[PDB]
Amino acid sequence: GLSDGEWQQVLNVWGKVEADIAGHGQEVLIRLFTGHPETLEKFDKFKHLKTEAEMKASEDLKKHGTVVLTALGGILKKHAAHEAELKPLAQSHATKHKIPIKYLEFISDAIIHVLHSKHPGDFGADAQGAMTKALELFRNDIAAKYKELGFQG
Amino acid sequence: GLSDGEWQQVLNVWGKVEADIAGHGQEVLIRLFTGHPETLEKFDKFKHLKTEAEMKASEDLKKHGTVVLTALGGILKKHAAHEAELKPLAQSHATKHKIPIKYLEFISDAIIHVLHSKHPGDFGADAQGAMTKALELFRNDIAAKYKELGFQG
Numbered sequence: 001g002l003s004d005g006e007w008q009q010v011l012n013v014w015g016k017v018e019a020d021i022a023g024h025g026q027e028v029l030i031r032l033f034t035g036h037p038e039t040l041e042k043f044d045k046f047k048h049l050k051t052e053a054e055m056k057a058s059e060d061l062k063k064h065g066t067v068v069l070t071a072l073g074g075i076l077k078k079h080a081a082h083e084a085e086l087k088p089l090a091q092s093h094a095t096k097h098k099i100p101i102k103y104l105e106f107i108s109d110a111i112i113h114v115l116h117s118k119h120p121g122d123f124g125a126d127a128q129g130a131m132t133k134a135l136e137l138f139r140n141d142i143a144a145k146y147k148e149l150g151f152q153g
Numbered sequence: 154g155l156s157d158g159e160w161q162q163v164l165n166v167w168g169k170v171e172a173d174i175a176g177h178g179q180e181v182l183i184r185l186f187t188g189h190p191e192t193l194e195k196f197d198k199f200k201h202l203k204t205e206a207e208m209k210a211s212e213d214l215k216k217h218g219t220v221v222l223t224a225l226g227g228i229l230k231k232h233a234a235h236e237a238e239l240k241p242l243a244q245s246h247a248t249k250h251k252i253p254i255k256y257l258e259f260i261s262d263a264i265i266h267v268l269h270s271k272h273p274g275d276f277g278a279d280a281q282g283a284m285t286k287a288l289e290l291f292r293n294d295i296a297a298k299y300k301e302l303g304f305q306g
């Protein structure tokens with residue numbers, strides 16, 4: 001995994017990419033296509049491009065480069081944001097409050113029953129099934145953080 | 154995982170929880186503490202509370218319940234948002250263009266070499282190690298979506 005600090009280094013480095021996204025995008029696809037010519041074969045738009053000079057002159061290659069780095073930036077920002085909520089809760093619950101992972105299942109069951117009780121209009125058998133799965137996914141993600149911090153279970 | 158429909162049921166339910174004029178956080182913790190007395194022992198603030206009346210009378214238990222539901226809401230929203238940016242890329246790259254994970258590794262290496270080239274001062278061995286790990290995490294998350302769609306690495 002990455003620490004708090006490492007995710008912030010990644011987002012700071014991505015700040016630099018985003019500052020010249022056109023140039024960064026072009027150079028990434030030129031590097032990909034010159035380093036690994038086989039990757040060209042996936043692209044109807046580009047598979048006939050032979051040289052770095054031909055690639056630097058391609059307006060469509062520059063546009064596609066921007067699209068790739070924009071999408072990757074969005075995915076890394078959302079990954080980092082999830083980790084940023086997750087890690088502090090795992091860290092406090094595992095190292096300070098000393099909560100075993102199994103207790104997260106008990107509070108998950110309690111949250112489901114209180115939602116059902118208080119909001120039955122908003123929370124049917126479908127919503128309850130979906131919420132049960134969502135809280136299991138949450139527990140799996142905290143459990144992964146627990147493992148990194150030296151707790152299994 | 155959850156379908157797009159299931160995630161929206163969960164996020165819609167959580168919209169209502171966040172709206173709650175009367176916090177149901179207290180009732181969650183009372184239900185947790187009455188069903189699992191072991192969990193009560195982990196709270197220095199509350200482990201002495203014996204009766205539902207003592208629990209219902211606790212100012213700090215009411216406050217803490219709200220804190221729990223706010224944090225869980227935020228973590229589920231960011232989990233859903235990560236899946237939502239991941240899934241469309243996995244969909245197109247797995248089922249239509251059939252991009253192998255090794256080609257995602259090639260573009261990952263290409264991004265690293267362009268960053269090194271353009272930012273020799275701005276991007277040291279630590280920043281490079283952090284970025285290399287972040288792109289591997291991205292590839293692992295896409296690979297997991299590939300598996301769900303029936304496309305191999």
Ligand code: HEM
Nearest residue numbers: 039042043045067068071072242245246250252256257260
């Ligand atoms: C960080 C890695 C990658 C990102 C973020 C990314 C992102 C995108 C995005 C946002 C699109 C446009 C929407 C779509 O059709 O799905 C796209 C299209 C495409 N990607 Fe990727 N991609 C990546 C890696 C790759 C690699 C390594 C290849 C091939 C070796 C590839 C081949 C394609 C192709 C063929 C298209 C369709 C292009 C067209 O419109 O003609 N992608 N990619």
Ligand code: HEM
Nearest residue numbers: 088089092097099103104107192195196198220221224225
């Ligand atoms: C959905 C599950 C949970 C969420 C979202 C959650 C959230 C929080 C938050 C936001 C805090 C305050 C900041 C912090 O120390 O991290 C906190 C504190 C705490 N949590 Fe949890 N928690 C959860 C489950 C549990 C469970 C199951 C236990 C115990 C059985 C527990 C015990 C504690 C304790 C002892 C504290 C310190 C309370 C204080 O004295 O102020 N948590 N929790």
Ligand SMILES: [O]
Nearest residue numbers: 064065067068
């Ligand atoms: O791409």
Ligand SMILES: [O]
Nearest residue numbers: 217218220221
């Ligand atoms: O908590």
Ligand SMILES: [Zn+2]
Nearest residue numbers: 079290291294
């Ligand atoms: Zn991710």
Ligand SMILES: [Zn+2]
Nearest residue numbers: 118170173177
């Ligand atoms: Zn409520």
Ligand SMILES: [Zn+2]
Nearest residue numbers: 118173174177
């Ligand atoms: Zn309510």
Ligand SMILES: [Zn+2]
Nearest residue numbers: 188189190191
């Ligand atoms: Zn119990």
Ligand SMILES: [Zn+2]
Nearest residue numbers: 137138141232
């Ligand atoms: Zn998660």
